[PDB]
Amino acid sequence: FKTEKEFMQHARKAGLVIPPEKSDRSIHLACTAGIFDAYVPPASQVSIRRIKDYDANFKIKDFPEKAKDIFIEAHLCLNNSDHDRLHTLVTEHCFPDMTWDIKYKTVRWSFVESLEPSHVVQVRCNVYGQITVRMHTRQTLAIYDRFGRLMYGQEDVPKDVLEYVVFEKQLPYGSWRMHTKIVPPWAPPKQPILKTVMIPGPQLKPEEEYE
Amino acid sequence: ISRKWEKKNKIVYPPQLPGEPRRPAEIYHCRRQIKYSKDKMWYLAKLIRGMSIDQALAQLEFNDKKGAKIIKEVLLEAQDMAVRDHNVEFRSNLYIAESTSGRGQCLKRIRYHGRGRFGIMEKVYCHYFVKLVEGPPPPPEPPKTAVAHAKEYIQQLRSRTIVHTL
Amino acid sequence: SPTELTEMRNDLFNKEKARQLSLTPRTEKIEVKHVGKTDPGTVFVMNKNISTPYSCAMHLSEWYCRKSILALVDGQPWDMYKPLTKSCEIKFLTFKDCDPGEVNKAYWRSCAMMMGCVIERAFKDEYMVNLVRAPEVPVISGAFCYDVVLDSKLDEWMPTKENLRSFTKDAHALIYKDLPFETLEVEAKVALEIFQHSKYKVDFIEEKASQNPERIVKLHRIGDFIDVSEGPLIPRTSICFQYEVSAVHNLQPTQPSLIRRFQGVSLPVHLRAHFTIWDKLLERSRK
Amino acid sequence: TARGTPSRFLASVLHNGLGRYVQQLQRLSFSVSRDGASSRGAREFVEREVIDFARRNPGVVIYVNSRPCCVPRVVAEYLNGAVREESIHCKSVEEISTLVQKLADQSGLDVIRIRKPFHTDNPSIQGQWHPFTNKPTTFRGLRPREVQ
Amino acid sequence: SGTWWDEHLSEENVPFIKQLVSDEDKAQLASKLCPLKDEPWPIHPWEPGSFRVGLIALKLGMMPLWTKDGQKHVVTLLQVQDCHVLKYTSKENCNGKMATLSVGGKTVSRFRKATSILEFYRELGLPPKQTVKIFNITDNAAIKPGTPLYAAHFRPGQYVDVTAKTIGKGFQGVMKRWGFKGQPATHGQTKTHRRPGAVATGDIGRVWPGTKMPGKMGNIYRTEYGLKVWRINTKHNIIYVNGSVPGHKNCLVKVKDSKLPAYKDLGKNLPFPTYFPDGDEEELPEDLYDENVCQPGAPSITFA
Amino acid sequence: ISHGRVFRRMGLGPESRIHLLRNLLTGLVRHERIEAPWARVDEMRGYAEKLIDYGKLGDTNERAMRMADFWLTEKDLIPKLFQVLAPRYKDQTGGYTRMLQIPNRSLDRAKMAVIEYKGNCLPPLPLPRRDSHLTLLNQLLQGLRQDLRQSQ
Amino acid sequence: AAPKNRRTIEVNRCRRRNPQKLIKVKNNIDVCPECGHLKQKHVLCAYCYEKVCKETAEIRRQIGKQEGGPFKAPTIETVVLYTGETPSEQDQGKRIIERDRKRPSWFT
RNA sequence: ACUGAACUCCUCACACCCAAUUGGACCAAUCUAUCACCCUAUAGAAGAACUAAUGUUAGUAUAAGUAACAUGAAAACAUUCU
Ligand SMILES: [Mg+2]
Ligand SMILES: [Mg+2]
Ligand SMILES: [Mg+2]
Ligand SMILES: [Mg+2]
Ligand SMILES: [Mg+2]
Ligand SMILES: [Mg+2]
Ligand SMILES: [Mg+2]
Ligand SMILES: [Mg+2]
Ligand SMILES: [Mg+2]
Ligand SMILES: [Mg+2]
Ligand SMILES: [Mg+2]
Ligand SMILES: [Mg+2]
Ligand SMILES: [Mg+2]
Ligand SMILES: [Mg+2]
Ligand SMILES: [Zn+2]
16 A cells, blocks of 8 residues: 555455554654754754753854764664664664665765864754754765675765754763754765666556656 | 575675776566476576577567466566666666576365376476576577587687597 | 787777766766657666666667667767766657658768778788778768778779678677777867877877867777767667678879778668679679 | 596695605594493504504694594595595404504695506606707808708 | 668659669560570581570469360460560580570569669660579570570470479378378268378387378479470460479469470470570471361361 | 478368458457467467458448458447448558467466457557666667768 | 485475576667667567547547447447547548547657 | 516516305494594593385486477457457
8 A cells, every 4th residue: 555544445445344442552762753843054042951950061163062972873873784873873763864775785984174263053842852063074984785786975085065954862871962954955966876867757658648 | 495596686796996997787577476387497497598688578578388377477576676676877878697497386276187186286386597698698609500510610629639548 | 910900909999988988977866858749758767977878778668779879968879888977858859750860860870880890800911991980971972981091002993792791890890899989078189099009090089079079089980990970879789680891992182191981881680681782783883 | 446536746745855754644523422332442452552543743733622423534624724534433443553654654645547657747857859950051051952 | 671662652643663674664575576696606416415505484374285186185375475585605604414494584673683683684685584594405495684585495396394382282291292091081980081090100209201191281392294295386476285284373483495305306406505586497387287286277076 | 291381280170260360350350459379369360460451441331241241250240340440440451460378367377469450449469668868778779870960 | 206315405396496487688679769668579569558448438439429329330430539639531421539649659 | 489467587566356154353423531722642431334125205307399389360459259
């Protein structure tokens, strides 16, 4: 099937009366479905007290240096695929969005030193504190195949990336982790890939014509 | 049961050195439990076993057999996989390196014969395995010429020794 | 020596071919749309000056690599092995089309260029062979033409039937190599550097350079042999199936030197003719 | 059998007898259990005669490992890189003392079938027979039924 | 990719090529009709022991013919269609007991022959032929390759051997092929009516070679011997051979003089190398006849 | 041995091969384009062009009315025969149908075919066109035609 | 008669693998110029025939509406007109099947 | 005169070519006793060893892709025709 509607419309039509049953145990999440208030990149000190009310030892000045070590150690675990180490530095909204496309291919991401010091932009808040931090760093990329042939980016030349990495913290044992990465609409286009792509048009039945 | 052909698409080679020729892509694909026999599939699998993938889809569109309609569904899904998942840029730059057919788990029914006797009818199933290698197909081996037969005969005369002596 | 004239010219062709690739802006992506009756509205997001129309045909099928011969980039005929330049629209042109006008002409120039590679390398080294041009004669005339000037020793020289069969056996030897036509659009200043040793080809470069509002002249190369031409060409030399240098005609108004025209007739692998139809295209190609 | 098993020619390693005779063992390696009846004779070989053996040929370097094994092995490594690992499991002291002296005397070449019982490298001195030995020469090289 | 001549031609070039090569079909055949105005090989008189050329004729069909005894004879019409002499090999090259001419008849589309065959007829200057038969011959009878042979090469009263492939009857059973009696119909006889019986005996545990079994009947070369030529027809080049000739209608047969020992000296009054109509001496009538045959136009016969 | 035997044997007898072509020809007059197996089409095709010759014998011919009464099992197509089809082909003397090859039947892999009456109201079949006249082999042969026209 | 012995796979391979039993490679396959799908020579294109066979299936569905029941074959010649078309001079006295779609590029 | 064995000699080594039957020396694997501890030792025991019973049961071959089996026709798949 494709959707949840098309399953229930086929489970009704097949006679599959499946009972919606009640259970005492619920799915205990530790993330959110994206960002609370979507920051749009070109006053929120209420949300820094609501973070300090549960944590009670947290400085907004220290955190961009903490934000780099969350960002850098998350991206070095892509070079080895240490999935037990990504799960403590990256929330489960961000872990399928940085590992599912890179399975069965090797990446050789490497961090060289930044250009601008990181600084927090906004802060928002069974309660999830959320911190957006701006990153103007200098990175390299080299993504390969199964067969080891280069498919994206050269290995030596460092590039300039502008990043707004939203962070999140569940508020008893969770820490600050990467949650998502804001890509603005005015961002310059990414580096062109090394191979050429074909895009098929409509697959036409003999009765259908091309208009 | 074993499913080792599905796992061959997950081998990750180390990233290549620039002082090394480019490794061609390999795309292992299979369909299991085809309601067709494993030795009627061999004539279709032997036919396409060296061809490029566009010549293979041509010679299977016009075969009258049942399995040619099924191999053409396998070769099209493995060609769509090679540009999607295994990083081949050209659809046309593939050829069939291996094309075999194993037997599958077959069912058993009862065929009644002419008296109290009977027979055990077996409902045949089969597998079909393919590997596409990225590249132009290699040229077929020509017959060895009269020069090459004469070299092998003279090399067989040149190699003989005085046997059972010093 | 024509040994040292071949090593000198191909290094400057390679120097200009390497120069054009060096101006490529690190795989900039162009987007060409396929216009045609078959397979409509597909795009090929391709590299800027590395991608050719053969790479466009390689995405669709093997049938567009074998059957298709030219390329109608923006309504203009292009080689299949000439690098693209900008976002455009491509048709692929076949020998068996309803109007194969430019396909006939591009095949007509190519067997003229394939002939000139035979003429320079058939005479032994003590004889002087000099190419002039390839006249754009029509297909209805029955033979593609190539004007050559030989040395003064060979003024009362006319080849026999067994000499032209040694021309064709060197023209089928060029087909068996399956050599691709290395095309490259060169400016007029480099073209006079490659063709400095041949005064007949210097002035031909001057014809095409002022015909053109810029100084660009088409250069082509079969293998280790460079020649000018007027327009596009064929992808490979394996396209010529039937080939025969039919006759040699000495032109009539030749007071300074013999403008000696060569005649040949050819057909593709696509458009083969029967032995009795081809033999009648040989007795008409001797005029 | 001989059509099943590989075969080789009778050779030496580096012309082992021409200049000098080089002892072809490098190492012996004994695994010998401290508690175990299978290495009862192997413990008496180490106690009695491995010190008399390690002085009789000082080119062989002998390693007694003494680990808890069920089967005591002897791992003879030779000069051409070959390894012949054999067991001394439940052998008396007189049966290991000949098994080890057999390992010292032999070279590292395989114990597959040797084709010829000899090896001459210059087999001919007066020149090997071809059809034109023992055939007299005619005058002027005239073959039969040739007039001139 | 296999091609043919008609594949890449347009509808303006299809009827043009058809009329063109059929004009060179009739140009090359009409430029051979005077072989004596060319350079012929020398004309020798007949001697005892000399053998001459035969013919290749299309079998047209049969019709009755009557002699003056009033006895019906059946007679097979053999039309000589475009028969020529193709090549000559001496006895040194043949390594047989005689020399050979090669003779071909009944012109065929050039578009449907192999390339190696199409050049043999291009050096000869003829359209290609369907059957090419080889006639043993002496050194006297040696015609230049490229001369036509007509029906007046034979004369009435002469006996003639005719060779062609028989009518192919496919896989035939052992009753039609070998004339076996089969088994009776009733009185039992369950599954035997047309079956071969015992094949061999019991002691020999095998079947002898050359045992008559079911197989492919017909379609082999058979030769009839001693067939009289009753009349010839010089206008349409018809031989009127006595009796029945092997082969169906419109098949090409191989007509030559008889090898029978009773008809071995009977070439004294025959046109020896072949009939040359360029010779013109006593030009032959419309029909030549044997002395016994009642010609159509003679009065009704009477045995007084 | 079936030398010279020009009729296919079909059905379950010589009667049933006429009743098989009769339903195939009744569908051809009604629809003017029929898919059928290729051996059943080209066996019908002799009867499909011999029938229009019997419609051109006229409506009022009793010998032609008896033949249309047999060969059309739906009696409404006998007005369509004598008043539509036989007036449509009153110029030409033959070749009323065109028979092509279709890709084989998906059920039993049978060699299929389509006949149609020429010049009907139906959409045209994708007919096999000859090679174009501007191709290289046709222009080299057009140059030879115009030269040999100047040989006179 | 029963087999006296068992045929081996060495004997069975040389029977069921020689080129008399193998699938012959066919060389008929061209490309259709009209649609680019690949067809054989001597056979109509499978794609381009299904263009016609699904356009004829709609025309025959409207012929069946204007007749009404069986045995209504008219003695009047037929003309298929698509949308925005006028019956010309030769279509006077002809049966007109008014179709709904646009006149296709291959119909004429 | 030469050829010619498993006879006899030669170099080394020797318990190391009969059916039924009989005597003897060893032993795989298992469990138990006690050891042993990458797979063993000495003993005690026993459902203690399978190239063969038209053996039993399961798998899979061969015969074999063989014998055999099936859908009246066209079509708008409404219908009509045989
Ligand atoms: Mg079975
Ligand atoms: Mg009888
Ligand atoms: Mg009976
Ligand atoms: Mg009975
Ligand atoms: Mg039947
Ligand atoms: Mg002896
Ligand atoms: Mg003894
Ligand atoms: Mg024990
Ligand atoms: Mg037991
Ligand atoms: Mg067993
Ligand atoms: Mg048993
Ligand atoms: Mg089988
Ligand atoms: Mg059988
Ligand atoms: Mg059967
Ligand atoms: Zn089509």
